[model samples]
Target: DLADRFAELERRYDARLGVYVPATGTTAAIEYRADERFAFCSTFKAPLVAAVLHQNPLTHLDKLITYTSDDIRSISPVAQQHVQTGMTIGQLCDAAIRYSDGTAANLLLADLGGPGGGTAAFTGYLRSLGDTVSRLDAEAPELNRDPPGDERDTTTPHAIALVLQQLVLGNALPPDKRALLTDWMARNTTGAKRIRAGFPADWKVIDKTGTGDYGRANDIAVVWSPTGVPYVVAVMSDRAGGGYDAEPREALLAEAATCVAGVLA
Candidate 1:
C-alpha cells in the first residue's frame, strides 16, 4: 500500500524516485534510472569530507587547519571568497556544510589531496561502502593543473540514495565520525525551501543541492520521520525551467516521501 502511494506521488510530481533497501544490511536503495548518470554539483562534498577524514590523522580535535589562497585556488568558483586568510578545517567544514561555502569545500578538497587525490580517495571510500556505479567528474584544469574542458562528476540516483542510506544507518563512518558528518549535513545551506517544502513544520530534512551553468539542478539527501523511519531521496533534473518553480519540484519530493512513509505504516 505504501509503495503504491509512493508511485502515485511520483506520477503527480513527475519526479524520478527511489527507495532505501532495508534487507541489504547496507541500506542499499533502488529507483528507476537510479543508476543513470547525473551531474553532481556540491553534493560531491559529502564524499570529499569523508575522504579527507579517512586520509588525515589530524582529527578535528587537533590543530585548526585554516584556508589560504593556495587552498582556495584548488577549487574555483566555490572558494573565491576565502582566498585571503586561514581557518581551521573544522571551521571550513562548518561553513561548507552550514553555508554551503564554496570556499570551505574547496579548502577541504585541497586538504584531502587536491582534486585528483580527493576523487581517488572518494572512489576508494565508496567501494568500501558497497558502491559500484559512482565516479568523480574531472577537476577543472585550473584546479587540477591539467583540467578537462568537458569534465564533470557523475553519479546515479541509486548510488546516491545508497550513500544516504549508509550515512543514515551509521555504516558509512564510525559512530562519532558519522554523527559529526550527519550533524553538519542537517545544517546544509542549499535547497532549504526547494527540497524541504510541504512537510509538517516539525519534520527534519537534511539535504544537499547542486547546480551548474548547464542547467543542471539536482538535490539528494535523507528525510527522517518522527517515527524513526528514514528515507533516502535523490532528484536530478537537466531541464531548463525546472527550478524556477521550486514549489512544484519540492512538492513532488515531499509528497513522494510522505507516500513512502504512508506505505511503511
Candidate 2:
C-alpha cells in the first residue's frame, strides 16, 4: 500500500517524501529515504523559540526587546525591509510562531545567541530529551553567517516524531511552557491546503511550513483528528524550482497526508 502511494505521488509531484503519524508511535509510513537531510528554513525556529523560552525564564514575556538594523539578518523580503518597533518577548514569539514572521525569527535567533548559539541551545535541549539523530547546522557560531552549501539542518521522521511525542506526553517542556508552545503551534499561519490537505475540515492541525532557496519546502505539525486521535507529522520536499514559494509543494504534501489519514481512518 505504501509503495503504491509513493509511486503515484512521485509520478504526480516529482519529489521526495517523509511522514510520521503519532497515534501509531512508529515510523510506519514513508515514500523516500526517511533520513535524507534538507534545509529546515523557518521550521528550525520552533525549537529555537522553545529552547530560548525554556532557558531564559528570568526574561519576562512582558519585558521589551529592541532590534536595530544590525540585528536583522534574514533573507525574507518582508523582514529585510521592515522597520521593527519595540515589542515584548511574548509578542515577538507570537509573531514569530503564529505568523512565521522572518523578522521575529531573526530577532529571537539573535537574542538566543545568534544562529549557532541558538541552534546549539535548542539541540542541547533536544539531546536532553533523547533525540540524538536530529543534528542542527547552526551549532558553529561562525557558520551562522554565510551558511555553507553543505551545511544542511537535518531531522528524521522518527526523530521529529519523537520530539512531538515528548511534547504530547509532557516530557519536552514543563506543563506551562508546553502549553505555550502548543498554543502558538495551533495558531500557525501555514494553513491547511498543504501539509494538512488530507484531513477533514474539523480536524485541528497545529503546523509550521518552511521554504528557502534551492527548492527547500517542509512542514512539521501535530494533528488532532475529529475523533480525538492525535499525531505528529513532518513532511519535507525539494521541488524542481529552486525557490521559496511553497504553495505547490504544500499542496502535494496535503495530498499525501490525506492519503495517510484515509488509510488510518
Candidate 3:
C-alpha cells in the first residue's frame, strides 16, 4: 500500500516525511508523521495570501507594488523580470505562489507591515484555524529579499492539509476570494517535478511549494480526480540532507502522490 512506500521513502532518506489522506474531514485522516512539525517555508506564503484577502477588498489585489534591483533576488523568478518597475498585487501573488518569488513575498510582507507584523498576522491567522506553529523573526526584511524559514516558522502535515481544505471548501475565505487563491495554486510550477510528476495526465493539482537552506522541501495541495472530487494533501520534510535534494525529493513526492492515489482510487 501507499503507506509502505511512504515508510521506505522516509527510511531511505533518513529524513521525516508527513503524509495525510483518507480524510473524513480536516481533523480526521490517515497520516504518516503528519503530526511532526517541519519548516513551513513558503507554504506559509499561501496563508499570507489569505491573510491579505482577509484585510482588504478583492480590488486590493489589483493595486500595484513597486520594485527596484535590490528587490530582485534569484529566488523570485517573476520579480526578476520586473525589477525596473511595479506590478499589481495580483501579479505579485502569481509570482509568489507560482514561482515562489521571494521579492514578491517580501513586498507582500512589506504590505503586511514588514516581517514582524506579517508574521503576527500569519500566526494569528493560523491560530484562528485551531492550529499552532512557532514564528519568530530571525532576520529583518529587505526589498526583493525572501526570508528564510526557521524553527520560528513551522507546521505539521496535518496542519497545512487542513489549510488547503479550508481554502477549497471556502471555509478560509469568502467564495470569491477562495476562488482567486485556488486559481493561483492551480498554476503553480515550482513542484512540477514533484507530485505533478506522478499525477495522472489529466488529474488536477492546485498547490504550493517551499524550500529553505536546511534540507527543507515541501508541497501542499487541493487535488482533484479526473471526475472532479477534491482532496487535500501535504508533504513536508527536513531530511534527505539539510538541503533541497531536488531529484530525490521529487521522486518520492511523485511516488507518494501515486501511493496516496492508489488508496483514494
Query: What stretches of model 1 exceed 4 Å from their correct place?
Result: 1-30, 58-62, 66-84, 114-117, 140-152, 240-265
**Residue 132: error of model 3 in Å?**
2.1
Per-residue error for 153 in candidate 1, Å, reads 0.9
Candidate 3 error regions (>4 Å): 25-28, 114-117, 134-150, 240-248
lDDT tens digits, residues 172-207, model 1? 677776776778788776676545663454666777
TM-score per prediction, in order, is 0.72, 0.82, 0.86
RMSD of each: 5.4, 3.9, 3.6
Cα lDDT computed for each candidate against the true fold: 0.58, 0.66, 0.71
- Candidate 2 lDDT over 143-166, as tens digits, reads 222222454466766677667667
lDDT by residue for model 3 (66-138), tens: 8798756547678877767688888888888888887777677667664574667667777777666534242
Clashes found in each candidate (C-alpha, N, C closer than 3 A): 10, 2, 5
- In candidate 2, stretches whose alpha carbon ends up further than 4 angstroms from where it belongs are 23-32, 75-84, 114-117, 138-151, 240-248
Model 3: which ten-residue window has the lowest total lDDT?
Answer: 138-147
Q: Quick one: ranking by lDDT, best first?
A: 3, 2, 1
Better of 1 and 3 by lDDT: 3
